[PDB]
Design a binder for this molecule. Sequence first.
Ligand code: HEM
Ligand SMILES: Nc1cccc2nccn12
Length: 289
Amino acid sequence: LVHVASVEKGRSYEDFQKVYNAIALKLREDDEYDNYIGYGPVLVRLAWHISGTWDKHDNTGGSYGGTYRFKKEFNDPSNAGLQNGFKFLEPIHKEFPWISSGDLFSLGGVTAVQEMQGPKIPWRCGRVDTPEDTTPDNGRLPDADKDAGYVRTFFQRLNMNDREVVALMGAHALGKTHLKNSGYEGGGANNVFTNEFYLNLLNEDWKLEKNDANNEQWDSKSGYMMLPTDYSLIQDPKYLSIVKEYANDQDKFFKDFSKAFEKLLENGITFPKDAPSPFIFKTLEEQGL
Ligand code: HEM
Ligand SMILES: Nc1cccc2nccn12
C-alpha cells in the first residue's frame, strides 16, 4: 500500500494559512468548551488518534485517508469524546470544502499546538480521502492501564523510539481526562503548551488511587493526574532520563515534540520529490489577528 501525497488542486501556502486562521479564530471564539479549556486539547488528541492507527508493517491506518469520518472509526471506544473535535471542525470544513479530511484533522492539531503557544509544527498537505473499506478496525490505539514495556512495544508499531514517545506524551499536560470518555478523571484545565507534564511527573507527590470508574490512576493533592502509562515514564530508567531532560530544557522539549508530532502526522505518506516543502504557519498573534 503506497499513499502518495497529492496537493489539493491549485492550492498553496496561503490557502492553508487561511484554514489555519479559521481554526485559530474559532479556538479563540468558542472558549467555553469543557469548563473554559476550549477546544485546543481535544483537537491535538484528534490529530493523534487519526494518525495513531498507523501500522508500519502494512501501511494500514494513518492520517492519509481521513477515515475517522467513517462510523467504524468515529465510534471506536478509544475515540470517545473526539466527536467534539469533529463538530468543531465541521464549519471549517464547510467553509473550505476543498481540504481533505486527513489534512483538516492533522492541521487542526498543528493549529491547536501553535495557538496554545507551543512549538511551530511544520505541516505538509496532500492527504487524500480513501474509501470506507480502508478504515482501520478498532483496537489500534493504546491502552492507558499498562506499563512502560507496553508503551515501548506499542509505539514501535508507529516507528517511534524512546525519545519520540517521551516527547509526544508531553501533550498530556493539556486538557483533562474525562470519566465518561475513557474511565479516567481529572488533570485540571490547562490550555497552554508547556513542558509542565515532565515537571509535574518529577515534582508532585503522587498517590495511586482508584477513580469512580474503579480504575487506578495517579493523583496529586494539587489536582494533577497521571495515567498509569504516564507514570510509567518515571518507572522505566530510560524514559526517566528523557523526562528529566525535558523537565530541564523547555526549548529542547519543544524541538523534539515538533519533530515527533510532524512525523506522527505524516507516517504512511509518500511525498513526491517535487512536493512543496513543509509549511510553517504563522499564529494569529504573529499576524496581528
Ligand atoms: C500511551 C499512549 C497514550 C495513552 C494511553 C493516552 C491515553 C489518553 C486518555 C485515556 C486520555 C483521556 C481522554 C478523555 O477521557 O477525554 C487522553 C487525553 C489526551 N491525550 Fe492521550 N494518550 C496517549 C498518548 C497521547 C499522544 C501521543 C498525544 C499527542 C501528542 C496525546 C494527547 C492527548 C490530549 C491532548 C488529551 C486531552 C484531550 C482533552 O482534554 O479533551 N495523548 N490520552
Ligand atoms: N495525565 C493526562 C493524560 C491525558 C490528558 C491529561 N490532561 C491532564 C492530565 N492528563
